[PDB]
């Protein structure tokens, strides 16, 4: 009917994609083998999950997912884990040597040896689609494969699948879990070259997730396991609309129509509520009014920034659970009045709303509590330029002395590619400044 193919590139890409597929199965009634037995299924008749899962003659539902990594240790856990029989071996692709946190090795030197097999495995998936919508691409910014190989794959998907949408989930770096000093370099390099290829990109700041884990989940020193559990809970809120019957963001096309009025400024900010610790003492379930209000607290955002020093281009609210439309209309009126939210001059001011009545799902045993009703706000604020500026300033500091540049030059990339990418970033900063003027 209208399928979506998900692509997971590098460690972060593969690890978050695996946590997402685990939650999808739980949401749809799919077992780790791929079966959907009568007992496990929601008896509502909603078959929209077929956009993410293909079906075999034996009734096995298979994720339309491709996992790529230049090194095998991450994908070998997927091949061995609980979901070893969920994906076909053909969908799990591994190199032998990784990009050593170098954008140039993933894009040029090493990436070029695997790009044609990756496109072949993607074409195999695409062939089973009667009406493919496009792609959801999961990757880090700071790693050499997640940055370098992703931009190479994005460049090629545009050519081989011209009329198809490309949505990203990008892992934005943080010092608490940083593995490389060159991450600002890779982050700025993948942004410049991917910019015209993606239609909508959702940045996941590792620091924002770290803060939410420490503060709402009471996790003292969060590890990737903790982070990916909250990341997947949130990313699944953003993708739900694609996998279930609904009236908002039902296709990849609708994400730009509802969220992206200006193409370069295509980085919406996501705010998820409520994030509750499974270990918390009894509390009354938080109301539509309460969860809607949490959407405007910058502590609940998955990118560290302040929309109160910035303007809006778009705002979507995707509600899940025991959510009464009359209670949502009443709560949005309170936000449109008692809250001082400012839109950019040539965009309508309305807040788009979606309500899926099925109860929210969490992974049994994890850090998160099962809530009665939840919300994900997707908003395109100019405030997100704060996250760009932080990466740009760190890039400027090292590039002022040509520190570590030699690694990139000696791996197929030209020196002028650094300054050209930084120019595109300076132009993007100015674009955000131009749309916010009064």
């Amino acid at each position: 009917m209208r399928e979506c193919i998900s692509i997971h590139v590098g460690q972060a890409g593969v690890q978050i994609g695996n946590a997402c597929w685990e939650l999808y199965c739980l949401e749809h009634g799919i077992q780790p083998d791929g079966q959907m037995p009568s007992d496990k299924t929601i008896g509502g008749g909603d078959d929209s999950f077929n956009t993410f899962f293909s079906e075999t003659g034996a009734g096995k539902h298979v994720p339309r997912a491709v996992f790529v990594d230049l090194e095998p240790t991450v994908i070998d856990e997927v091949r061995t884990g609980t979901y070893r029989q969920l994906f076909h071996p053909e969908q799990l692709i591994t190199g032998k040597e990784d990009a050593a946190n170098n954008y140039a090795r993933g894009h040029y030197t090493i990436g070029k040896e695997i790009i044609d097999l990756v496109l072949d495995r993607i074409r195999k998936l695409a062939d089973q689609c009667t009406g493919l919508q496009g792609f959801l691409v999961f990757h880090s910014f700071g790693g050499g494969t997640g940055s370098g190989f992703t931009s190479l794959l994005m460049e090629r998907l545009s050519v081989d699948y011209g009329k198809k949408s490309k949505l990203e989930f990008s892992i934005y770096p943080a010092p608490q879990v940083s593995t490389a000093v060159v991450e600002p370099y890779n982050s700025i390099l993948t942004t410049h070259t991917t910019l015209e290829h993606s239609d909508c990109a959702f940045m996941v700041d590792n620091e924002a997730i770290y803060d939410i884990c420490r503060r709402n989940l009471d996790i003292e020193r969060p590890t990737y396991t903790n982070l990916n559990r909250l990341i997947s809970q949130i990313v699944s809120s953003i993708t739900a609309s694609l996998r279930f019957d609904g009236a908002l963001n039902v296709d990849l096309t609708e994400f730009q129509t509802n969220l992206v009025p200006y193409p370069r400024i295509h980085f919406p900010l996501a705010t998820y509520a409520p994030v509750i610790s499974a270990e918390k003492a009894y509390h009354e379930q938080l109301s539509v009014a309460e969860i809607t209000n949490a959407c405007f607290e910058p502590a609940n955002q998955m990118v560290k920034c302040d929309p109160r020093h910035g303007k809006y281009m778009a705002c979507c609210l995707l509600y899940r659970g025991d959510v009464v439309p009359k209670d949502v209309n009443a709560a949005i009126a309170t936000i449109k009045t008692k809250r001082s939210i400012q839109f950019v001059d040539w965009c309508p001011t309305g807040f788009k709303v979606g309500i899926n009545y099925q109860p929210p799902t969490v992974v049994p045993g994890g850090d998160l509590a099962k809530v009665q009703r939840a919300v994900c706000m997707l908003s395109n604020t100019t405030a997100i330029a704060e996250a760009w500026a932080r990466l740009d300033h760190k890039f400027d500091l090292m590039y002022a002395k040509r520190a570590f540049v030699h690694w990139y030059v000696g791996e197929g990339m030209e020196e002028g590619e650094f300054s050209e990418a930084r120019e595109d970033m300076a132009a993007l900063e100015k674009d955000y400044e131009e749309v916010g003027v009064d």
Partner: protein, 157 residues
């Protein structure tokens, strides 16, 4: 039996309570929920309506045939397409002409749902209606009639 409790919840003031009562009435496919889910097909909320349409396919009562044919005119694409698949499941030849018209819907999912519901109904009304459509009709309806006739031949020719 929580059937009576779920039937009363179908007329609750809260739309997600009405929805979850329709989902549960489909799992507990009882004849006591046929008139109640037929009424939920006139629900103000499309999500309750589309779930009532599926729940009525599951029960398979002949009583749901005429209100599921009215649901084929519904404003919402999920209500039209789930009503089509419910009528395919009931298999009543009373749905053959409204399902052929649903082949011309602007919604792709509604067209596919109606094409597949006609193939699940079968019989002589569908045989005759496809023979006519594969000669006098065009487009999706024509490919559906041709496909129906090809998959139903007793010989190789």
């Amino acid at each position: 039996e929580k059937v009576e409790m779920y039937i009363k919840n179908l007329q609750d003031d809260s739309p997600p309570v009405r929805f979850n009562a329709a989902v549960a009435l489909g799992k507990i496919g009882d004849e006591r929920a046929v008139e109640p889910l037929i009424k939920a097909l006139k629900d103000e909320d499309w999500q309750v309506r589309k779930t009532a349409a599926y729940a009525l396919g599951k029960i398979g009562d002949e009583r749901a045939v005429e209100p599921l044919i009215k649901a084929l005119k519904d404003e919402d694409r999920y209500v039209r397409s789930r009503a089509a698949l419910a009528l395919g499941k009931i298999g009543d030849e009373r749905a053959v002409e409204p399902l052929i018209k649903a082949l011309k819907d602007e919604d792709e999912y509604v067209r596919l749902s109606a094409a597949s519901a006609l193939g699940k109904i079968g019989g002589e009304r569908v045989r005759a209606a496809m023979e006519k459509l594969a000669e006098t009709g065009t487009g999706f309806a024509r490919k559906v009639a041709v496909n129906y006739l090809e998959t139903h031949k007793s010989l190789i020719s």
